[PDB]
Amino acid sequence: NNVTLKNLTAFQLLSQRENICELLNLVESTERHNSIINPERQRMSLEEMKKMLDALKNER
Amino acid sequence: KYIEESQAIIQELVKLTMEKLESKFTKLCDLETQLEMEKLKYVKESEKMLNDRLSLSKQILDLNKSLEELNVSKKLVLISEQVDSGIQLVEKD
Amino acid sequence: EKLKYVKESEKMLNDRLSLSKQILDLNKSLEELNVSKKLVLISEQ
Amino acid sequence: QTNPVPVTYPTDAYIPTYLPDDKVSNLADLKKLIEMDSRLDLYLTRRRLDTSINLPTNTKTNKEMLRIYVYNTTECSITIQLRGVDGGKVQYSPNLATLIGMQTGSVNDAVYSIYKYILINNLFVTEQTEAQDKPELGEVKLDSLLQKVLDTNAAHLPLMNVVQTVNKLVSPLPPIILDYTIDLSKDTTYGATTLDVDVSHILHQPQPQPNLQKEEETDAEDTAKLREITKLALQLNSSAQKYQFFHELSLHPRETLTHYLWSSKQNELVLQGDQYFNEDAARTSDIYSNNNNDRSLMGNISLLYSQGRL
Amino acid sequence: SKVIVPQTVRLAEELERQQLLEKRKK
Amino acid sequence: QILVKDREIKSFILFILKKFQCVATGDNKWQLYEGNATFFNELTHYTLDLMEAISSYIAPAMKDDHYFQTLVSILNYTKDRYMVISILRSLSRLLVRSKANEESAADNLDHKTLSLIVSFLLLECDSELIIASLDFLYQYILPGSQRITELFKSKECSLILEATLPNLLSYNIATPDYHLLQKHKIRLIKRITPARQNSIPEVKFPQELSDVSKVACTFLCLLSNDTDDGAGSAFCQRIRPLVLHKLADIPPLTLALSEYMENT
Structure with missing residues (x-):
């Protein structure tokens, strides 16, 4: 919750290193990439959108 | 495909929601105009009633004084707890 | 709020009319016995 | 409140505008939704302000009565309250009841009527009134009636004194008082002794609704929803920044790679600037030894001695 | 720290307001 | 007073303000690379402060004034509070001696x-x-x-x-x-x-x-x-x-x- 010079430099360096290691394909981030996408959450949100759209369609 | 269907659905949903909210806003604006009209009429009538009430109370005071001047046992009394509710000439001891 | 305003306006109007009638009758009675002035509603000029 | 209460969690976040409009096709809808949310907020916050006009009246918008019997039976004051009496309706003094046209009302109604009377008859000392005809400005010139009401033989009371006297001129509704002293000769009386008193204001019982049980819940729910939305927006920013980095790398590889190398070297140099400060390097004679190739520690001694600090 | 009310700004404000008040007096 | 009588400083302030406007309106010409955002941030702040000061010495702003347009764009965009208050002061100072009938900056x-x-x-x-x-x-x-x-x-x-x-x-x-x-x-x-x-x-x-x-x-x-x-x-x-x-x-x-x- 506190930000010092050490924390800032470490954060920036970590981001840079992660990006570069991803360029060389030296990292497997399936867990993060599927917790952010979360296809289950995608299906849930899609069904919620469909239900809301049907509700708006039938009120007329 | 998946995201494409989601995109079409989102377009339609947003369109319908915007239309619904705009209709609601139009209704609310009309109702607000009506409220302002009624408030203006009420303000006019209430100011008239208040001025009449104050002037009539002062006149009642003067007339009771005059009645006491000419040796008349009557008084001018409010029928109820205001002037707007009515006044009348009563007799006391 | 709108309904409140409408109701109060109508009540004030009715009370004004009734008070005008009462004032007319009281002025007639004061003229009957004795008086130098008369009750006057400011709204009626 | 007069200040926005600095908090510890992020309260908002920008939406990135450097994404390609062709690939991302739902930014326009999100911005439309944000605009509509802002409009709804404006409308609610505006219409939740008090702008209702209430002029002083009474008899606001039955057969229900009550009879009290008193009788001495054989073989002294009496006061009675009704507990339906609050400060919302009081008894105006008999003097004030001639200034205003009413006898019973609220306190704010009395104050408003006093001010309206001072307005109708021009009694405020103004620039024009002084120029036409010493009293200060914004003072009230008293008439015979205002003097009989305030009981002051002065002529130029200010307004605070008038309204404080108004506070003086108010008393609660009087209770029921009877004087039935005694009766000892007759067997029983059951005389008239009847009082017809309204209890309408007590049997109707207009009560307010329960509060402070959903206000806190609504506040907490809205805060949680806003924080979730802000977290999602920050995640979007992160993804967009990674995309932008890789796009820039695809455009100019050499410059971005040189920048990466230089920045990594510099950040690694920075992160190694406090390693010999841990009470282990401090308590042992290693970092003070001259055999260190880098002598950035002992070399200061001379200067530190000349400054006297040491 | 910023100076919230500079001298020239206050002077120009007072001058313009006095000028417009004099114009209204006309 | 010495700073106002200098075309270079005013031109630099205008350049930075136009870059900020390009960032604010979301133009595709010049898009800030986020790896540099930090720098830009500080830059903008200083510039605005400068503008605020010199805003008193360009008081009557004409119709097609670039300062006014840049500032209104930034005002409609930003979420900073220091920035909003500074922009409001700067705008209120650019309308000191202006006529209502005469065409002025107030039409922007x-x-x-x-x-x-x-x-x-x-x-x-x-x-x-x-x-x-x-x-x-x-x-x-x-x-x-x-x-x-x-x-x-x-x-x-x-x-x-x-x-x-x-x-x-x-x-x-x-x-x-x-x-x-x-x-x-x-x-x-x-x-x-x-x-x-x-x-x-x-x-x-x-x-x-x-x-x-x-x-x-x-x-x-x-x-x-x-x-x-x-x-x-x-x-x-x-x-x-x-x-x-x-x-x-x-x-x-x-x-x-x-x-x-x-x-x-």
């Missing part, structure tokens, strides 16, 4: 920006933002009457002003509370003395106004001095009864709203 203020500033008026938990908005509106409607018409042409600005100004009159001055009375119940005092009920509690009155209330009073006084049969004068008549309530509750308000009560 579309209804969106005015609605935004009156929305700032609508807040409650920020006295400084309210005072800045009121100062800007004062400087806006000050030179003449055509600007009053342009201000009240928008329905949203009109509604927000009408709902806000009387409540800004009684802003943070602790009016007499008539709720302790409604909650106070009347009983008999338990206990040879006759039976009293109890004493109705006292009612105190405020003795001084707040800064927001003083600025609102000055704004109403200025707004009341316009020609009748035109907008701005009808606004005061639409607003009068609520102001009468406020005056009944606050005596220093009656002393301070003299010019408003004269022209009504």
Whole structure:
């Protein structure tokens, strides 16, 4: 919750290193990439959108 | 495909929601105009009633004084707890 | 709020009319016995 | 409140505008939704302000009565309250009841009527009134009636004194008082002794609704929803920044790679600037030894001695 | 720290307001 | 004074402001690379401060002034607060000596920006933002009457002003509370003395106004001095009864709203 010079430099360096290691394909981030996408959450949100759209369609 | 269907659905949903909210806003604006009209009429009538009430109370005071001047046992009394509710000439001891 | 305003306006109007009638009758009675002035509603000029 | 209460969690976040409009096709809808949310907020916050006009009246918008019997039976004051009496309706003094046209009302109604009377008859000392005809400005010139009401033989009371006297001129509704002293000769009386008193204001019982049980819940729910939305927006920013980095790398590889190398070297140099400060390097004679190739520690001694600090 | 009310700004404000008040007096 | 008489510094400030406008409006020409955002951030702030100062020495801004357009774009975009207040001061200082009939910079203020500033008026938990908005509106409607018409042409600005100004009159001055009375119940005092009920509690009155209330009073006084049969004068008549309530509750308000009560 506190930000010092050490924390800032470490954060920036970590981001840079992660990006570069991803360029060389030296990292497997399936867990993060599927917790952010979360296809289950995608299906849930899609069904919620469909239900809301049907509700708006039938009120007329 | 998946995201494409989601995109079409989102377009339609947003369109319908915007239309619904705009209709609601139009209704609310009309109702607000009506409220302002009624408030203006009420303000006019209430100011008239208040001025009449104050002037009539002062006149009642003067007339009771005059009645006491000419040796008349009557008084001018409010029928109820205001002037707007009515006044009348009563007799006391 | 709108309904409140409408109701109060109508009540004030009715009370004004009734008070005008009462004032007319009281002025007639004061003229009957004795008086130098008369009750006057400011709204009626 | 007069200040926005600095908090510890992020309260908002920008939406990135450097994404390609062709690939991302739902930014326009999100911005439309944000605009509509802002409009709804404006409308609610505006219409939740008090702008209702209430002029002083009474008899606001039955057969229900009550009879009290008193009788001495054989073989002294009496006061009675009704507990339906609050400060919302009081008894105006008999003097004030001639200034205003009413006898019973609220306190704010009395104050408003006093001010309206001072307005109708021009009694405020103004620039024009002084120029036409010493009293200060914004003072009230008293008439015979205002003097009989305030009981002051002065002529130029200010307004605070008038309204404080108004506070003086108010008393609660009087209770029921009877004087039935005694009766000892007759067997029983059951005389008239009847009082017809309204209890309408007590049997109707207009009560307010329960509060402070959903206000806190609504506040907490809205805060949680806003924080979730802000977290999602920050995640979007992160993804967009990674995309932008890789796009820039695809455009100019050499410059971005040189920048990466230089920045990594510099950040690694920075992160190694406090390693010999841990009470282990401090308590042992290693970092003070001259055999260190880098002598950035002992070399200061001379200067530190000349400054006297040491 | 910023100076919230500079001298020239206050002077120009007072001058313009006095000028417009004099114009209204006309 | 030495800085103003320098074309290089003014051109640099204008260049930085146009870059900020390009970032704000989301133009595809020049898109800031986020790896540099930090630098840019600091840059912008300093520039704006400079602008603020020199804003006093370019006072009458003409129609197609780049400073004004850049500043209104940044104002519509930013979420910073220091930045919003600085931009409002800079805009209010670029309208010092300007005529209403003559074509000036005030014609670059579309209804969106005015609605935004009156929305700032609508807040409650920020006295400084309210005072800045009121100062800007004062400087806006000050030179003449055509600007009053342009201000009240928008329905949203009109509604927000009408709902806000009387409540800004009684802003943070602790009016007499008539709720302790409604909650106070009347009983008999338990206990040879006759039976009293109890004493109705006292009612105190405020003795001084707040800064927001003083600025609102000055704004109403200025707004009341316009020609009748035109907008701005009808606004005061639409607003009068609520102001009468406020005056009944606050005596220093009656002393301070003299010019408003004269022209009504």
